A paper describes a structure:
Thus, in the absence of mercury(II), MerR still represses the transcription of the structural genes by capturing RNA polymerase in a closed inactive state. MerR is a representative metalloregulatory protein that exhibits high sensitivity and selectivity to mercury(II) in vivo and in vitro.
Here we report the crystal structure of the C-terminally truncated Tn501 MerR in complex with mercury(II). The mercury(II)-bound Tn501 MerR was crystallized as a functional dimer in an asymmetrical unit of the P3121 space group. The long dimerization helix plays a critical role in stabilizing the dimer by the formation of an antiparallel coiled-coil dimer interface. In the functional dimer of Tn501 MerR, there are two mercury ions bound at the equivalent site. However, only one metal-binding loop in the MerR dimer is fully ordered. In Tn501 MerR, the bounded mercury(II) shows planar trigonal coordination geometry with the S-atoms from three conserved cysteine residues (Cys82, Cys117, and Cys126). The Hg–S bond length in the mercury(II)-cysteine complex is consistent at ~2.56 Å, and the largest S-Hg-S angle is at 127°. The Gly79 residue in the corresponding hinge region participates in hydrogen-bonding interactions not only with residues Ser125′and Cys126′ of the metal-binding domain from the other monomer, but also with residue Glu77 adjacent to the C-terminus of the α4-helix.
Residue numbers in the entry:
A (entry chain A): 6 to 34, 44 to 120, 126 to 133
B (entry chain B): 7 to 34, 44 to 134
Write the structure that this text describes.
Amino acid sequence: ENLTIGVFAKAAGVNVETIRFYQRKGLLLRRYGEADVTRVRFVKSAQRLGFSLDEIAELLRLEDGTHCEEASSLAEHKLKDVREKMADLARMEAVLSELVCACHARCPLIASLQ
Amino acid sequence: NLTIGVFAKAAGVNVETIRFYQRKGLLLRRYGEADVTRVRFVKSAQRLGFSLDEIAELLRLEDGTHCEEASSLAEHKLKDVREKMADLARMEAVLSELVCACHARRGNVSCPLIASLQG
Ligand SMILES: [Hg+2]
Ligand SMILES: [Hg+2]
């Protein structure tokens, strides 16, 4: 059926503040139905995979599910970015671990920073 | 002693970065070796992921006689790095999975990425 702002949110499993947030950023479109629910879960899911608000708008451009080549591309690009970020964080984790190890085994941290 | 440009060269960083560091007040119109050492301190820390605030705290311990307190900042940072990696890893796993299914889609079936984003 059609639904009020509060029931919409309940059906979509999200805060009312989040529905409003999504409306102001224009990731949506009185009352609401199942397409709206599905649309909100679309956004929330994508957001959770690390897509930016902009990237999600592009992704929604392809919502009718007949542009697979273009969809993969957004995901593959995001994946590339994720992997770079992980490779950087990994480089930090390695050195930080190494510094701590030397801290406990004694200031080497400061020494190494200089 | 050294000019803005040579300072940066000696410190192995952009001029924009020296200025950046001055405006945020992590520094000490000439410059010398303490300034160089101080900039390498910041740049290094920044490269290990320390925030500008965390670096100010870390600089409080610059004389190298507060090992307990230093480790703590590093250990806390290390925890945060690992969390972030664990989150990114979660994304990477599902995204990889979606792409794999994108490339593998059969005939005229609807886009799995979108499908998964709606289910
Ligand atoms: Hg796809
Ligand atoms: Hg230490």
